[PDB]
Design an enzyme around this catalytic site. Structure first.
Site, PDB file in Angstrom:
ATOM      1  N   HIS A 249       0.829  -1.204   0.000  1.00 58.13           N
ATOM      2  CA  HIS A 249       0.000   0.000   0.000  1.00 58.13           C
ATOM      3  C   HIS A 249       0.856   1.243   0.000  1.00 58.13           C
ATOM      4  O   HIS A 249       2.074   1.169   0.119  1.00 58.13           O
ATOM      5  CB  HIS A 249      -0.895   0.041   1.256  1.00 58.13           C
ATOM      6  CG  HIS A 249      -1.924  -1.043   1.307  1.00 58.13           C
ATOM      7  ND1 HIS A 249      -3.153  -0.930   0.693  1.00 58.13           N
ATOM      8  CD2 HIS A 249      -1.885  -2.284   1.852  1.00 58.13           C
ATOM      9  CE1 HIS A 249      -3.826  -2.057   0.854  1.00 58.13           C
ATOM     10  NE2 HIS A 249      -3.080  -2.895   1.553  1.00 58.13           N
ATOM     11  N   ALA A 250       0.194   2.387  -0.121  1.00 54.22           N
ATOM     12  CA  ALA A 250       0.861   3.672  -0.107  1.00 54.22           C
ATOM     13  C   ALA A 250       2.047   3.732  -1.056  1.00 54.22           C
ATOM     14  O   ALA A 250       2.113   2.982  -2.021  1.00 54.22           O
ATOM     15  CB  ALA A 250       1.302   3.999   1.303  1.00 54.22           C
TER      16      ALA A 250
END
Ligand SMILES: O=P(O)(O)OC[C@H]1O[C@@H](O)[C@H](O)[C@@H](O)[C@@H]1O
Ligand SMILES: O=P(O)(O)OC[C@H]1O[C@@H](O)[C@H](O)[C@@H](O)[C@@H]1O
Lengths: 275, 87, 275, 87
Positions: D14-15
């Site tokens: 993620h991110a």
């Protein structure tokens, strides 16, 4: 020729530290009818230098630059810029580029001095990336100067560097606690790391401030979101961004500028991490 | 032509609440200033006001000189408490 | 006609929550060669609506809007916009405006359900401004639904509203602790408030999670900067901003769009505030 | 034409570390995909990759089909560990 929009280069907008400066800049830009083009650089010199052209190549009435390391090469290109450039919470030795900050060296000193005035002789310093001039050129020196002036030893094993993350704060206390002569007080160069220093020590069972006093830097909102509440050196993040923008509007609108080198007042908010 | 207060804001006169107090004085014609620790500045100036670093508990005196003195001074006294700065 | 710069309206960039979404947006805009014009609205409908014109009046290839309250009037003006508009971490019942979020109602439910599965019958909910639809329309309902489905009472005195600040979190626990039937678990709609709930209870001497279990929402960095470490519902702030931007580049470049209503996956990070 | 890993990142995929893994696969010609929980997506797509919500401890299989398969797959395996995502 002019767009009434200033560009702002920032290492990382998601960091509370920079997000706070951005809000101040944005507020003042709004006040003076300007638009902002924010861009993250992540402390990458290559990215930083590139983003400089971009903003100029999009003709902006100004540029507010923030960085942990404003190198000679950065300064060279910034002097070349066709528009007014003001540095926020960043420094370069020559003072050729306008900037708004606080007196870091003096603030580190005041911090340590209060720990000395409190009867501390073994005081450590958990610092951020030592390469960045605000750290090795200012905060470290303020810390050392407070020590020498009181005729105390300046041990290098009492200075450990973190990376601004809460975890490095944890790793720093443990390393410092491995020392034979345990420090009784610790000055941390950033609030987030100071929380890690506080927690890392409470996890080792010690009590703050009874067994170990601590002082942070910036006085962010994290300082009050800890138990004990962190005593912290005050750097007005918002004011720095706000004033750095105002200074910029003075150059942009060609108003009377008293000084292009500004150091806002600093103080220390004493809370519970100290006695 | 002026009023004195004691700042209650824990953050003192800084950040947005300071940008708000500036915005407010700027909406007038009179000449509004801030007196602190023996230093007077233009309450309509961001740099001036923020260069004083007015902490909590300090005593300040906002002054007004113009065709709308009482209005400025009264509106600011209202902003002072409306913003939780002091009284 | 086109500038390759999108405008983003945000309540407050200094709030870690929004600062995180901004970083995701900015990263993806960069990836797809776009520029961003950030502007703070502070949850002021008048300011918000005004800032909409500004961006359009400066001809931007797109608009990413964030707000705690997207009202019918907001939706009306957003449908009128000449350019693609995508809502980030915000909701409006009709689903007429593209948006990227998580299934708030379902996430609140899963949160409370785990507390029920853990043997809790008296579960409270410390919420943010109840007026905002994500709160009264989703989080509250998810919380209530988890209760009813397990055949538990749905007491309104067990729901106290904060204002997203760490202090309101403190004030909320104290109010909840004044209740005759003390809650044994508390679901907080935001990490910052959950820290205040945790601290406010430790200041009252109770132990988390032994005397009181707690669960937050967002899984920000604050969740790991507390002791105990906060169990928190995961909302991918960065992904939401990133994906909301990507969705926008799809509309801007007229690519194939599967759905304008996106709900990224959510989960729960179990840490120490729960058993 | 493919490699399998176990995600070690506590934040999962993620991110930024996810934007980085996407950026990387995008620098190739082959067709790179991500296999997770019986779902395959284009590793060059932000929405696709982020719509899977790959948590820590999960098992994924990145595949490559093109004139530069081994190069993509090898560069990504390098990105996988360079980014602390997994191995
Ligand atoms: O907001 P905090 O946690 O005190 O962190 C501030 C620090 O954050 C770091 O990322 C910056 O590089 C430092 O210059 C800054 O001082
Ligand atoms: O980042 P934290 O402290 O969990 O706070 C997040 C919250 O911050 C608030 O300001 C927003 O209005 C909420 O919508 C958001 O969920």
């Amino acid at each position: 020729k002019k767009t009434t929009t200033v560009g702002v280069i920032i290492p990382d907008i998601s960091n509370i530290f920079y997000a706070e400066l951005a809000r101040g800049i944005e507020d003042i830009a709004t006040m003076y009818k300007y638009n902002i083009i924010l861009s993250n650089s992540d402390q990458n010199q290559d990215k930083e230098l590139h983003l400089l052209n971009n903003m100029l190549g999009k003709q902006v009435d100004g540029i507010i630059f923030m960085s942990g390391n404003v190198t000679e090469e950065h300064v060279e290109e910034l002097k070349k810029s066709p528009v007014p450039v003001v540095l926020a919470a960043s420094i370069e030795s020559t003072n050729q580029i306008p900037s708004v900050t606080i007196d870091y060296e003096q603030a580190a000193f005041d911090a340590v001095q209060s720990l000395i005035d409190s009867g501390h002789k073994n005081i450590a310093f958990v610092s951020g990336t030592l390469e960045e001039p605000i750290n090795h050129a200012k905060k470290v020196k303020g810390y050392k100067r407070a020590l020498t002036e009181s005729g105390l030893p300046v041990r290098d094993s009492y200075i450990v560097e973190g990376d601004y993350t809460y975890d490095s704060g944890i790793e720093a206390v443990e390393k410092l606690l491995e020392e034979d002569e345990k420090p009784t007080a610790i000055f941390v160069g950033t609030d987030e790391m100071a929380l890690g220093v506080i927690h890392g020590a409470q996890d080792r069972g010690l009590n703050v401030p009874n067994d170990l006093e601590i002082i942070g830097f910036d006085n962010t909102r994290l300082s009050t979101m800890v138990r004990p509440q962190l005593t912290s050196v005050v750097q007005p993040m918002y004011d720095i961004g706000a004033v750095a923008m105002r200074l910029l509007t003075k150059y942009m609108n060609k108003e009377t500028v008293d000084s292009s080198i500004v150091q806002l007042p600093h103080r220390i908010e004493f809370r519970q991490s100290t006695k | 032509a002026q009023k004195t207060f004691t700042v209650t804001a824990d953050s003192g006169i800084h950040a947005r609440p300071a940008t708000t107090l500036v915005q407010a004085a700027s909406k007038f014609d009179s000449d509004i200033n801030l007196e602190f620790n023996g230093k007077t500045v233009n309450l309509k100036s961001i740099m001036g006001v923020m260069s004083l670093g007015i902490q909590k508990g300090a005593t300040i005196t906002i002054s007004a000189e113009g065709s709308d003195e009482a209005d400025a001074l009264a509106a600011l006294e209202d902003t002072m408490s409306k913003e939780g700065l002091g009284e």
